[PDB]
Design a protein around this nucleic acid. Structure first.
Ligand SMILES: [Mg+2]
Ligand SMILES: [Mg+2]
Ligand SMILES: [Mg+2]
Ligand SMILES: [Mg+2]
Ligand SMILES: [Mg+2]
Ligand SMILES: [Mg+2]
Ligand SMILES: [Mg+2]
Ligand SMILES: [Mg+2]
Ligand SMILES: [Mg+2]
Lengths: 188, 226, 260
RNA sequence: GAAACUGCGAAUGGCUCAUUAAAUCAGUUAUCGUUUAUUUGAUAGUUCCUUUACUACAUGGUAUAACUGUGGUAAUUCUAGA
RNA sequence: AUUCAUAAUAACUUUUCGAAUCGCAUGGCCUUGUGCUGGCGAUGGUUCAUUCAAAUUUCUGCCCUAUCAACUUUCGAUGGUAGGAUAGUGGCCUACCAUGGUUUCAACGGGUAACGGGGAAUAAGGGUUCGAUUCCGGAGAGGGAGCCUGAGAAACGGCUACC
């Protein structure tokens, strides 16, 4: 089927190569997963040496890290808003690595409440002493404050759904967030 | 055609010829898994209810469940499916199988009784066929006899007697999954081994930590002065 | 092609096995084990070809299946088990023990040892790594892993294994003026003392070795096996002590012996 | 101890030289760019329903082969129903 | 030489493994019982290492031919970025971008009554010719393609299709 051998390519001089051998199993490729959103559906593919892989088809939730606070939360994915490789992936909401998505902002809001208690967006001393000690770190970033106000958070996918079967990622921050804001998510 | 009919509650079987093909038409355009009434099938099956279990057409091709056609087709058959026994690991073969829908081309129709009729038959319901052999697993015998849970199964294992002409001797199946002191010994051996390996590892780690503490103190207190 | 090979054609077997060209199309292919098949001695080769305790592989199998032979304290009924350098072979009958060491002509020589020496063995440190749960370990030349080693044990050192429990009882660092044994190349079987070594960052550290009677040679670091200090080796040397006399003076010794 | 289920092997061997001209191959490299049954050494006291469900671990149940029978096909290492 | 080995933190998972398996022996301690505790094994079982390997890969080296001088690149050619796929690197493939890459030091094309090598015949030296064939490596199983099972096959005394 799909083959990864370099034999079929032209030579670096531009010459056509003569057929050397039949396609080998140890050089095969497989078709893309094309991971969609919603109604989780994983398929397992058996690979070389056993070592099964997980094809993520139409999954809806993933684990996303907030690298500034050192926490990762399980949160569902709203949609794909940017892909640096192909705009068709954005149009079809295909979930791949490096894809820019919006997720939920809700588990992160609730953790922020429980950890700092700053009623972000619009009891006993046991928690109050902890909140006072964790103060001076309550302020984070205006650009993510506004996304919390909007109710969804910009994230970048860092896992490979077609390989591991999971769509995990991290919240966009700092220069990366400002860059992706300029690129397509803003300026229409 | 022929009707291979089986009465399963006693495991009895017989084959019935039905000529005058204007009467097997009750089966026509039916499929495996559909009940049929026996009065139309014949005057002997008054009230008897048959259901289609299978069949074989002329040329002997078996009928496949799910193939909703009155004709036979070729199919790529795989392991653990009907009409094909693989001869190798992962071998799949293309074979012709008859469709599931009953038609005039069938030579034998395999039927099973689901409801008893009004009369009795010469070889189906008047007799019985005993089961080949009884339960072998411990809880299978315990369920079969249904006495209790705290009961010996050695005495309730079913025994069969075989005569060699001069001496008759009984034999019974070897009970599986039976709890035994040997199994208990194996289990406690594995348990003790896991525990013992845990202490061995902890002791080795403690000794290594002692060695590192000794070297860390000595090799650095000796070089502090220099 | 399509998978691992299971046959070893004769004339493709290692030359140091000293197999007769005729009398067979095939040679005993060593099974997977502690040693590479190029520098290993199968049990059938040691028992039939070297010791003449068997006439053929059928009698070799008859010997092994009686639990008579044991390698490094374990029975090892495998006919083609890859016993290699420094290994200890024990025969329950005949009350003898053997240690597999090359003679100076680069082949395993039948070398008998005592029970005290058969109780232990040496190993060359191939790597020192931190295992799971932060536990350090070392890997010897015979594919053996020993957890919790001495912190000063570095790569290509020598460790002494108790051979009844896989534990290190002593170790020798790799340093100038230590008796080494050559285990590869054209210098198989030589025993000498390290003069110095050449660094050569980028691969193939080079070691200069001086023989007992002042024959200087150089060898790759991969073929160097420390076995003790200047004098007093940790292992009983085979007959010859690895000196590599020239062919003229081997002739002279042979004639002196034969003609009295 | 037939048969059959399970496991392992059947990717070795043997044969031939059609293709193949930087391809194969040879010597020499690299894997800090990966897979690895088997062998050998080491190597799992954490399993609490994804807690106010520890309910059998003196040990959970299903579903089948072989076999008993009814058979189809001219025919194959074809197989159906019970 | 490393973002290495390891180790820690926050979670994640059609929740992987963590022995409901088998054979000989059947001792010790009494709480005297389908009591406790017990050896030598066999078969398994994550992970690391090892071995047998495998796959890709650096440099250099092939016969005749110019009555073959330009070749490659929309259908990837040469690079970049990102993704997908793979066991894994890689235009292996995809999207976008740049216009690159090889060549008289012979590219590209054509021919080979070409499998390569260890080697063989001859041989003052230098050479010439041969190597389908006992060993090594490659390829194939009428021709193609596709695939299942498996650690390992694009297997053919495996399957599927077309000829
Ligand atoms: Mg072969
Ligand atoms: Mg890439
Ligand atoms: Mg690229
Ligand atoms: Mg040819
Ligand atoms: Mg040749
Ligand atoms: Mg082939
Ligand atoms: Mg296998
Ligand atoms: Mg054949
Ligand atoms: Mg074959």
């Amino acid at each position: 089927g799909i083959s990864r051998d370099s034999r079929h390519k032209r030579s670096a001089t531009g010459a056509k190569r003569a057929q050397f051998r039949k396609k080998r199993k140890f050089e095969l490729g497989r078709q893309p997963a094309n991971t969609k959103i919603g109604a989780k559906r994983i398929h397992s593919v058996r690979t070389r040496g056993g070592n099964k892989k997980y094809r993520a088809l139409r999954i809806e939730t993933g684990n996303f890290s907030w690298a500034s606070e050192g926490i990762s939360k399980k949160t569902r994915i709203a949609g794909v808003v940017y892909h640096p490789s192909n705009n068709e992936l954005v149009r079809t909401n295909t979930l791949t690595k490096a894809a820019i998505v919006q997720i939920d902002a809700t588990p992160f809001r609730q953790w922020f409440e429980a950890h700092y208690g700053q009623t972000l967006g619009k009891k006993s001393k046991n928690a109050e002493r902890k909140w006072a000690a964790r103060a001076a770190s309550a302020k984070i970033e205006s650009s993510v404050e506004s996304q919390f106000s909007a109710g969804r958070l910009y994230a970048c996918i860092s896992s490979r759904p077609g390989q591991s079967g999971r769509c995990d990622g991290y919240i966009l921050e700092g220069e990366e967030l400002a860059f992706y804001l300029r690129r397509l998510t803003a300026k229409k | 055609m022929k009707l291979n009919i089986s009465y399963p509650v006693n495991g009895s079987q017989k084959t019935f010829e039905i000529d005058d093909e204007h009467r097997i038409r009750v089966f026509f355009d039916k499929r495996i898994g559909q009940e049929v009434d026996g009065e139309a099938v014949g005057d002997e099956f008054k009230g008897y209810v048959f259901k289609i279990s299978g069949g074989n057409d002329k040329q002997g091709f078996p009928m496949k469940q799910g193939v909703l056609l009155p004709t036979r087709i070729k199919l790529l058959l795989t392991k653990n499916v009907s009409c094909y026994r693989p001869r190798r690991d992962g071998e799949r073969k293309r074979k012709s199988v008859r469709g599931a829908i009953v038609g005039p081309d069938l030579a034998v129709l395999a039927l099973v009784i689901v409801k008893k009729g009004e009369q009795e038959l010469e070889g189906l319901t008047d007799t019985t066929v005993p089961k080949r052999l009884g339960p072998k697993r411990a809880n299978n015998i315990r369920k079969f006899f249904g006495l209790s849970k705290e009961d010996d199964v050695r005495d309730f294992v079913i025994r069969r007697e075989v005569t060699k002409g001069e001496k008759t001797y009984t034999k019974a199946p070897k009970i599986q999954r039976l709890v035994t002191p040997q199994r208990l010994q194996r289990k406690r051996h594995q348990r003790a081994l896991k525990v013992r390996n845990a202490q061995a590892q902890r002791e080795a780690a403690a000794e290594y930590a002692q060695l590192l503490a000794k070297r860390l103190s000595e090799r650095k207190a000796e070089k502090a002065e220099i | 092609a399509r998978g691992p090979k299971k046959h070893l054609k004769r004339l493709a077997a290692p030359h140091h096995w000293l197999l007769d060209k005729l009398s067979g199309c095939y040679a005993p292919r060593p099974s997977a084990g502690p040693h590479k098949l190029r520098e290993s001695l199968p049990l059938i080769v040691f028992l039939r070809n070297r010791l003449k305790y068997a006439l053929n592989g059928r009698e070799v199998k008859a010997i092994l299946m009686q639990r008579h032979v044991k390698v490094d304290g374990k029975v090892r009924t495998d006919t083609t088990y890859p016993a290699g350098f420094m290994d200890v072979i024990t025969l329950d009958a005949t009350n003898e023990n053997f240690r597999l060491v090359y003679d100076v002509k680069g082949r395993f020589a039948v070398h008998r040892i005592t029970d005290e020496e058969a109780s232990y063995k040496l190993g060359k440190v191939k790597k020192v790594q931190l295992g799971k749960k932060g536990v350090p370990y070392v890997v010897t030349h015979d594919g053996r892993t020993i957890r919790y080693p001495d912190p000063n044990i570095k790569v290509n050192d020598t460790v002494k294994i108790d051979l009844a429990s896989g534990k290190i009882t002593d170790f020798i660092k790799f340093d100038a003026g230590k008796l080494v044994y050559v285990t590869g190349g054209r210098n198989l079987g030589r025993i000498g003392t390290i003069v110095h070594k050449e660094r050569h960052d980028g691969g193939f550290d080079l070691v200069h070795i001086k023989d007992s009677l002042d024959n200087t040679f150089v060898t790759r670091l991969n073929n160097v096996f420390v076995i003790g200090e200047q004098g007093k080796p940790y292992i009983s040397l085979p007959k010859g002590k690895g000196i590599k006399l020239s062919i003229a003076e081997e002739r002279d010794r042979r004639r002196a012996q034969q003609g009295l």
